[PDB]
Structures are given as structure tokens and as C-alpha cells.
Write a protein that binds this ligand. Structure first.
Ligand SMILES: Nc1ncnc2c1ncn2[C@@H]1O[C@H](COP(=O)(O)OP(=O)(O)NP(=O)(O)O)[C@@H](O)[C@H]1O
Ligand SMILES: *C(=O)CCCCCCCCCCCCC
Ligand SMILES: [Mg+2]
Ligand SMILES: [Mg+2]
Lengths: 350, 20
């Protein structure tokens, strides 16, 4: 990072080496995944941090160490009913294999008769979503600090042939240093060609997903455009009461910007929210560098962000260990584990 | 205002992922 500051572009061979070694590390774990590294009775379940279609994420306390973690619980029967087996196997296989400063760490995983469990580091600062809705919008420098972390994270993930496919503020957690931790690998997939699954979150879907066209990692760059817009405006570029109305707006690709957006921000967004794939930033000959070298990012020290050396725009409140003040309350429900093994064959590799 | 239109809309809370 001194060389990148001293001579822009001079770091490119070193970044290439970093990524090559990162892929070696990833592939070892991808090829031989960790399995069965804890069990349910090792944790006290404290409070729900969020609910989803297949289960919930709970704050737990590891009994033996006293450490807090966030445990994602997935009901096997529902996963099977909704035809999400492969997605759930992808989620765990990928999350246990990655290693990057802005990706949540998976510490343990296991299954029992009823459920799958993924035990992650607890990121106590809450969802970006909560802070964004409360404050209204982020200033451009604040939005840019977060956006830079996502750019680097996608550079990392895409280099491993991974597509993320659910970027949104609800899946971005703020840590105790004010940096992002990406959670929710439910739609992450390792794919070298194109893929076809309609998945994501409506506001963030690229037109090529919507139109059942086949698509590639460029959908993550589109989603970055939506995220930057939403962070800086306070509302998404395509919103309505119902997904059908949102989809109509996305495929028009007409986007209107708040009058307070800078010229550089509007230009970056026109290039990310580009319906034409031959024109979308992140998907051109120079790849991620078209984004990293854009005028809006001129003040961004990419390597300093990676090293977490940049002062964060804010640090969330922290009352002590196990504090959930930065999260909404959810209805609690007793975890019941059946006496019969459910869906054993389907989840053998988990 | 566009902000007022968003705040009055039905999708200002946490948004669930979708799939078919
Ligand atoms: N490591 C973590 N630390 C703290 N909170 C977390 C963590 N992981 C997830 N959460 C919270 O739990 C919520 C649900 O987790 P997530 O993995 O997004 O579930 P999901 O069921 O896949 N949701 P979605 O697919 O977005 O509808 C998140 O939105 C956060 O509020
Ligand atoms: C500084 O200029 C010296 C050369 C730096 C090379 C190491 C940097 C690796 C981190 C890059 C960011 C991650 C890319 C996904
Ligand atoms: Mg989520
Ligand atoms: Mg999900």
C-alpha cells in the first residue's frame, strides 16, 4: 500500500499474488470442508437477532469460553420443502472456506435431527439497514467508506469464482470498529459460467435476473450501484409497494438522482446501473479497476481500507458483552429437536 | 417528495430475500 500510494498501478503484481495465495487457501477448504465442529448443548441461546424464511439467527453464549456468537438455525424440512437444499449446502461450504476482513467469520457448524446450525462471530453493531433508516441517508464520504469495502469484497469473492447475489443493507453488519461484515451467504455460489436462478432481493435484482436471461457476476456490480444509491439517497433507485412494480422500473433502467448527488456519484451510478452488459462497470475489459479508478473513489486508499486503517464515520454504541441494543426485537420460539432424523441423506455433506 | 413517497410505501422495513 505505500507503492500504490507512491506509484498507482505499481501494486498490481502484488495484488495478483495476494489473490493467488488467497485462492490456494480457499481451495483447500472448498475441497475438504470442515464439518461437525460443535454441538447444540455447548451454547446458551439468549435472544433472536433476526428471523428469515428457514429459521432465525440467535445471539448465543459459548458455555465453556464465555464468548458470544451469532447462530443461524435452519429447519431441514422447510429447506427441502422450498427446494433450497443446494443453496443451503452452497452457503455453508462457501462461508467455511472464505477469509477476508469484511466477511463474517464462521466459527463452527453442525446439524442435528431437525436443524442445520452455523455459528458465526457476533457482530454487535447491528445491520447497516437500521442505522441507514434511522439517520435517513449517509453523506457521500460515509457511503463511500462502506462502498469501498464492498468493492474489495467482491474483488476477493469474484476472484474465487464466487457470486454473492444478496447485497443489501440488511445483510451488512457494522462491527465494533465501524467497518462492514457481510453476512448471509444463502445465495452465494461457485460458478465459472453463467447461471440462471431467480434469487436475491427485489430492489437489488439486475435486469438480466428479472428477465430470465442467464447471468454472471455482473449482477453483483449492479447490486453495488443499488446499494450506493440507497445509502446516499436514503431510498432505493427502484421502489414501489409490490415487487412487480419494482421489476418494471428496473428493466426500464431509467434512474433519477437526488439533486444533492455529486456529479461523480451520478456518473458512477449510471455506469453501475447500466442495463447493457457490454457497458456495465465491473464487467468491462478492465474489470474492477474501472470502479476503483473512478473519480468518485479518487480519495479512497484501497489498501488502507483493506488494512482497516481508515477512521470510520461512526462506531456503534456498545454497552458490553452480549448487548443487543443495535438490533430489533423478534418473537421468540422454542427450538424443538425431533427424536427422528429428518432429511439425513439430503444434508449428508453439511 | 421522493423521500415522502418512499416513507409512505409498503417496503421501508427489512426486506426478505426471494427465490422460486
Ligand atoms: N454474524 C452475525 N452477527 C450479528 N447478527 C447477525 C449475524 N448474521 C446475521 N445476523 C442478523 O440476522 C439476520 C438474518 O441473517 P441472514 O443470514 O440474513 O438470514 P436469512 O434468513 O438468510 N435472511 P434473508 O435471506 O436476507 O431474507 C441479519 O439480517 C442480521 O440482522
Ligand atoms: C502497497 O502498495 C504494496 C503492494 C500491496 C500488495 C498487497 C495488497 C493486497 C490487498 C489488496 C486488497 C484485496 C484485493 C481483494
Ligand atoms: Mg439476510
Ligand atoms: Mg439469506
Amino acid at each position: 500500500g505505500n507503492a500504490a500510494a507512491a506509484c498507482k498501478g505499481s501494486e498490481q503484481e502484488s495484488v495478483k499474488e495476494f489473490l493467488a495465495k488467497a485462492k490456494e487457501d480457499f481451495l483447500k477448504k472448498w475441497e475438504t470442508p470442515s464439518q461437525n465442529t460443535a454441538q447444540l448443548d455447548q451454547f446458551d441461546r439468549i435472544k433472536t437477532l433476526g428471523t428469515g424464511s428457514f429459521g432465525r439467527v440467535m445471539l448465543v453464549k459459548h458455555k465453556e469460553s464465555g464468548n458470544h456468537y451469532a447462530m443461524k438455525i435452519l429447519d431441514k424440512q422447510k429447506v427441502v420443502k422450498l427446494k433450497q437444499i443446494e443453496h443451503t449446502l452452497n452457503e455453508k461450504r462457501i462461508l467455511q472456506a472464505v477469509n477476508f476482513p469484511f466477511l463474517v467469520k464462521l466459527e463452527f457448524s453442525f446439524k442435528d435431527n431437525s436443524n442445520l446450525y452455523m455459528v458465526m462471530e457476533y457482530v454487535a453493531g447491528g445491520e447497516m439497514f437500521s442505522h441507514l433508516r434511522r439517520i435517513g441517508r449517509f453523506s457521500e464520504p460515509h457511503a463511500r467508506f462502506y462502498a469501498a469495502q464492498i468493492v474489495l469484497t467482491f474483488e476477493y469473492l469474484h476472484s474465487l469464482d464466487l457470486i454473492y447475489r444478496d447485497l443489501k443493507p440488511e445483510n451488512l453488519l457494522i462491527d465494533q470498529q465501524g467497518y462492514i461484515q457481510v453476512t448471509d451467504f444463502g445465495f452465494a455460489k461457485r460458478v465459472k459460467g453463467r447461471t440462471w436462478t431467480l434469487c436475491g432481493t427485489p430492489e437489488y435484482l439486475a435486469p438480466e435476473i428479472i428477465l430470465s436471461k442467464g447471468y454472471n457476476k455482473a449482477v453483483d456490480w449492479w447490486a453495488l450501484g443499488v446499494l450506493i444509491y440507497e445509502m446516499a439517497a436514503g431510498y432505493p433507485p427502484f421502489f414501489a409497494d409490490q415487487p412487480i412494480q419494482i421489476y418494471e422500473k428496473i428493466v426500464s433502467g431509467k434512474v433519477r438522482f437526488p439533486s444533492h448527488f455529486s456529479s461523480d456519484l451520478k456518473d458512477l451510478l449510471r455506469n453501475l446501473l447500466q442495463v447493457d452488459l457490454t457497458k456495465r462497470f465491473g464487467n468491462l475489459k478492465n474489470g474492477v479497476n474501472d470502479i476503483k479508478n473512478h473519480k468518485w473513489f479518487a480519495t479512497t486508499d484501497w489498501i488502507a481500507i483493506y488494512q482497516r486503517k481508515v477512521e470510520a464515520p461512526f462506531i456503534p454504541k456498545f454497552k458490553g458483552p452480549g448487548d443487543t441494543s443495535n438490533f430489533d426485537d423478534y418473537e421468540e420460539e422454542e427450538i424443538r429437536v425431533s427424536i427422528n432424523e429428518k432429511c439425513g441423506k439430503e444434508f449428508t455433506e453439511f | 417528495t421522493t423521500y415522502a413517497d418512499f416513507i409512505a410505501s409498503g417496503r421501508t422495513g427489512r426486506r426478505a430475500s426471494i427465490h422460486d
